[PDB]
Design a protein around this ligand. Structure first.
Ligand SMILES: O=C(O)c1cccc2cc(CNC(=O)c3cnn4cccnc34)oc12
Ligand SMILES: O=C(O)c1cccc2cc(CNC(=O)c3cnn4cccnc34)oc12
Lengths: 169, 169
């Protein structure tokens, strides 16, 4: 399936490369930010560029120092991550590296382009299969050593509360 | 198929975003470099990080000024491209933005991991289907306006000569 290929490329072309170096980048920034990469997986494939627009209680703090690596003819290809503070009744309840799983934008876009041959009704099913495949990959991956957490959800809602339930172990 | 999803995500998550801004970045660097993004598509899915290791006549010149954009919770996500000089009998015969199509690394890796459920024999077929799907996408895409060229090839070989045949219109 397309969700199967998306989960494998997201692991091979991104997670496999940043998850080994992540704790070192977090330690560097901490000179406190939590140790895992928190990945938001909205099953509706709704991926806004601004997290604060999804929930005002999710607030951008700072960028994590960039990771660079020569890859496939690209000198110093850059991998960037953002740090967010999570508010709960006016209080900073958590601080973590947080982002949406970008392949869900591909599912959203493919469901909209007629040439992609993917119906708008198939988004939910493909997102669920992307989630399951990625969980199966990370469960058995050596690069994932208590440093990655997938947060999958369907709105019937507090996004910051869903993140916080995961942050609080 | 997985090649279908890879071609659509490579377009949606990368090409769709950089191809509109590419001529402006090339004009900026030129204050001469050719106007198209040249994408190497080895059908054997062999993707080395160093182009000069694939052919000594392909020589790294400089980085093209980075492109940044806020995306899916990432503040200032970076898109980087490299400029190469192409030598032919000691002479600089061309200068272009050149890189390998990264999803071919996913096909290579999936053919090696038992959990991916993709045989090592299926690489060639999947790379060909990735190529055809991407050509079909770019043929009809509004972002592609004489600014992208796919260079697909099978070794029986000069890589620099294959690039140069495309560079010379
Ligand atoms: O990297 C993958 O293995 C991969 C596999 C499938 C689909 C996609 C979509 C992307 C996004 N690309 C970038 O962010 C990017 C930034 N500089 N840059 C230079 C060359 C190529 N890509 C990029 O990567 C993919
Ligand atoms: O971007 C896509 O739409 C896409 C779709 C499918 C597979 C892949 C693999 C990649 C490579 N990722 C990066 O280069 C990258 C760099 N910073 N960063 C921050 C968050 C996420 N990804 C990245 O992007 C994909």
């Amino acid at each position: 399936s397309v969700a199967h290929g998306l989960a494998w490329s997201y692991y091979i072309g991104y997670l496999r490369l940043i998850l080994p170096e992540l704790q070192a980048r977090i330690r560097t920034y901490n000179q406190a930010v939590s140790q895992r990469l928190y990945i938001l997986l909205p099953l509706d494939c709704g991926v806004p560029d601004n997290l604060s627009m999804a929930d005002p209680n999710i607030r951008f703090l700072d960028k994590l120092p960039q990771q660079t690596g020569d890859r496939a003819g690209i000198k110093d290809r850059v991998y960037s991550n953002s740090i967010y503070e999570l508010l709960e009744n006016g209080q900073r309840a958590g601080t973590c590296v947080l982002e949406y799983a970008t392949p869900l934008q591909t599912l959203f876009a493919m469901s909209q382009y007629s040439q992609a041959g993917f119906s708008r009704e198939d988004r939910l099913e493909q997102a669920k299969l992307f989630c399951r495949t990625l969980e199966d990959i990370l469960a058995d991956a050596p690069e994932s050593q208590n440093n990655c957490r997938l947060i999958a959800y369907q709105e019937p809602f507090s996004l910051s509360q869903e993140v916080l339930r995961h942050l609080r172990q």
